[PDB]
Amino acid sequence: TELVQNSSIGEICDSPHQILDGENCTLIDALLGDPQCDGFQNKKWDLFVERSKAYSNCYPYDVPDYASLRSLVASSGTLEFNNESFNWNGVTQNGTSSACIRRSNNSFFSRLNWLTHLNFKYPALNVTMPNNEQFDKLYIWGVHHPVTDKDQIFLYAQPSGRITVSTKRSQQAVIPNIGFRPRIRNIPSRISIYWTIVKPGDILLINSTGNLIAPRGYFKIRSGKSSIMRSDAPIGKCKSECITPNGSIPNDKPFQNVNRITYGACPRY
Amino acid sequence: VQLVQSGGGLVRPGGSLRLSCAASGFTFSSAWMTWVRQAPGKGLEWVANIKEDGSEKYYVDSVKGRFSISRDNAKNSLYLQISSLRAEDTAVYYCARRFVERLWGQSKPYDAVDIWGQGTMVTVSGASTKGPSVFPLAPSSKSTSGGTAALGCLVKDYFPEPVTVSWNSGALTSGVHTFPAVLQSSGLYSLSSVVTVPSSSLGTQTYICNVNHKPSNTKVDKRVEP
Amino acid sequence: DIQMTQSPSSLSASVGDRVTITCRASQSISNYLNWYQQKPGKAPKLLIYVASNLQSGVPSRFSGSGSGTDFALTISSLQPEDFASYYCQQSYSPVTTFGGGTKVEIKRTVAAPSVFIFPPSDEQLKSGTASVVCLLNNFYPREAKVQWKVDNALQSGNSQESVTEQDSKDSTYSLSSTLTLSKADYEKHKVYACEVTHQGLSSPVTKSFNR
Ligand SMILES: *[C@@H]1O[C@H](CO)[C@@H](O[C@@H]2O[C@H](CO)[C@@H](O[C@@H]3O[C@H](CO)[C@@H](O)[C@H](O)[C@@H]3O)[C@H](O)[C@H]2NC(C)=O)[C@H](O)[C@H]1NC(C)=O
Ligand SMILES: *[C@@H]1O[C@H](CO)[C@@H](O[C@@H]2O[C@H](CO)[C@@H](O[C@@H]3O[C@H](CO)[C@@H](O)[C@H](O)[C@@H]3O)[C@H](O)[C@H]2NC(C)=O)[C@H](O)[C@H]1NC(C)=O
Ligand SMILES: *[C@@H]1O[C@H](CO)[C@@H](O)[C@H](O)[C@H]1NC(C)=O
């Protein structure tokens, strides 16, 4: 008696559950398109393991609602991205920066489009996207916060940018905050990443007079079985139904004093 | 853009004093604001935090119940009420704009100073204010080397220092050494400011140091003459 | 709640050396570190944000690193204008404290001093006080001794001296020792000498004066 399976193998088994190791990448960096995370595009997982050594190496960005985005993206278990063609007439696309490097060249997030002025005219943008697919879509966009009024004017030809992302159930409006703020990766400007769920039969509406980090499409979202886990335990070649941040564990004994965080069929401590 | 302070000086221990810090060049009502001090010759020390809305206030443990930070968002000014002054409160209290934000959707946000003021001296002791007696340093013979001469002004017997010495209203600047104040046994301070000029331009070039002592309303313009 | 410890308190390196400053604390802070630089007698300057990110006007030779509890500020090629007291800020919830400073000195070239003596002014001698000033200009190392001699008699307990913070250009130091005597005690003598001892001088130099 008193058998609670008090030991772990120290590693995580890649079977039967399809394990995906983020390594130097977090879920959000691979979600956005950080150059170092380009190998993660359109890839599926049953469990996604974030590492403590992960870091960002693109443009400094914040995600205000970081927890729910990270959870619900991992719940669907897929990074499958479907490019959509928005009608961005009158603006300049494919904005690049020096802090975000692809293949020895300046670039930006792979799934985001950084819109600037076209011949110093940045018109009032009104794009409507229908989503007639039988499934909830996930759109990811952002708001650029220039450091000075000079950059605001040189980037968008508009002193007071405004952004309104709307659906038939929600409406999101963001105002950029220009300010003298320190550098991050040698960049004083910053971006705030936001998301919007578009249910089937509901049209996506986006109004933006400036500072719009435009989306390039959507992700397939669903409250599935897959999940995410923070763990530094290496991924090994073995088979185990139960997985914890401390490693994989046999599910034979009824309880488990290893870790309150488990994935799969586990003995419920 | 920068900040400006005022409200510092000598106060008897146990007395009160009010520091003000006016702001300009940014949105004041949307940034955390701080007070930071350093004793003469010592390191820097945090004192107070105040939130953008003036709701959450944080103090270093040695000043709780004695200091009170405040701010006015309609205007652009900080305040640091300072009561029950102790001798170990003698320091140059700076004014920073330490803001904070999340950098990758983090639980707790990363902070740092936004900029610094210049700081006002807040000395505390049972003492009396008196202005300095500025005396010249004659660049006479044997006080001049073969190639270059040297002169200055002695600023002796004066209390709480912030003291300012300039040469010829700010014309002569290159090659000036304003020495830090030394507290002499009489409880008064004393420093000197020197400058090296060519050993050939002495009988035709006029040299006047401009000493100004704010706490005593004393500004003197003394001619340093060989 | 959470306190730091900087190492070392003060140091000395040469031009072009690689100097590092250690900055440790109690809890595990991870990225929540910032580095500062006080140009002598001035306000602090933002140096590094979040352990490693450099800022505006920060030369390329500076670099910060670390995570958790062990952090390092590194200068890859030390320079004359890097003379400053460096501080490292902790981004805890209240910014409790931030480390006691690290004072760096360029410390090079071993330059010899120049000495000048100054009599008390005529206007001061009427007020009943005499002040004899002696100047040590543009010397290095720090260490130097000023000796006052009244009628060739050693003087102690009646003189005071100050040293300028290190110059950002030629990097030397400057010192001014002042002797103060009452006008009644002053006129009892004639020969007042300033004896200066320093490494760059092969023998102590004495600037003197009469009356
Ligand atoms: C993850 O991020 C790091 C941090 O920038 C990348 O730089 C590489 O970091 C490793 C860490 O030790 C350096 O050493 C390497 O270690 C691995 C593991 O033992 C070893 O197999 C390699 O042969 C190498 O010694 C490495 O010099 C450094 N730079 C590189 C690899 O260009 C790293 O590339 C990122 N990816 C991985 C898989 O670490
Ligand atoms: C902005 O940057 C994106 C980055 O993906 C560009 O999208 C990709 O551009 C390449 C151009 O080499 C496209 O490849 C080829 O495009 C030609 C049309 O000129 C087409 O005939 C070929 O069959 C082939 O597709 C690629 O399709 C396109 N999309 C993806 C997902 O790679 C984009 O072109 C850049 N410019 C603009 C205005 O968006
Ligand atoms: C968005 O843009 C359209 C097109 O100009 C406009 O009719 C509408 O009022 C704007 N705002 C919202 C909330 O739809």
Residue numbers in the entry:
A (entry chain A): 40 to 308
B (entry chain B): 2 to 227
C (entry chain C): 1 to 211
Please share excerpts from the published article on this structure.
We describe a focused, protective antibody response, abundant in memory and serum repertoires, to a conserved region at the influenza virus hemagglutinin (HA) head interface. Known broadly protective antibodies engage sites on the major virion surface protein, influenza virus hemagglutinin (HA). These include the receptor-binding site (RBS) on the “head” of an HA subunit (1–5), sites on the HA “stem”, and a recently identified site at the interface between two heads of an HA trimer. Stem and head interface antibodies realize their full protective potential through Fc-dependent pathways that lead to the killing of infected cells rather than by blocking viral entry.
A distinct subset (five antibodies from five different subjects) has a light chain variable region encoded by the IGκV1-39 gene. The five antibodies with light chains encoded by the IGκV1-39 gene segment, each from a different donor, all engage HA similarly. The HCDR3s, while unique in sequence and length, all curl toward the light chain and create a blunt antigen-combining site that brings light chain framework regions 2 and 3 into contact with HA. This arrangement accommodates the HA-220 loop in a groove at the heavy-light chain interface, with HCDR3 tucked beneath it. In all five structures, the side chain of Gln at position 55 hydrogen bonds with both the main-chain NH and the main-chain CO of HA residue 222. Also, in all five structures, a Ser53Asn substitution allows the Asn side chain to accept a hydrogen bond from the main-chain NH of HA residue 224 while donating a branched hydrogen bond to the carbonyls of residues 49 and 50 in the β-turn at the tip of the LCDR2 loop. The side chain of Tyr49, anchored by a hydrogen bond with an acidic residue at the sixth position in HCDR3 in all five antibodies, is in van der Waals contact with conserved HA Pro221. The HCDR3 acidic residue (supplied by IGHD3-3*01 or by n-nucleotides) then forms a double salt bridge with conserved HA-Arg229. The antibodies belonging to the IGκV1-39 subclass had the greatest breadth of binding. In the H1-directed response, antibody D2 H1-1/H3-1 ranked first and accounted for >15% of the influenza A virus antibody repertoire at day 28 postvaccination.
